[PDB]
Copies of this chain bind each other. A is one copy, B any other.
């Protein structure tokens, strides 16, 4: 569209996990307490 492009090869598909560390432990699952009342 009025701009001339240059041919190129397909690039390596990457996601977030390629570059950045997941700082969540896969060994220790901290559990949470129930409750839906605000005074409680």
Contacts and interface: CB of A to CB of B under 8 A. Distances in A.
A18 B9 contact: no
Contacts of A11: 31
Interface residues of A, number: 14
Nearest to A7: B33
Copies of this chain, how many? 7
Nearest to A28: B12
A37 to B, nearest CB: 15
A11 to B, nearest CB: 7
A24 to B, nearest CB: 14
A30 interface: yes
Interface in A1-39: 9-14, 18, 27-33
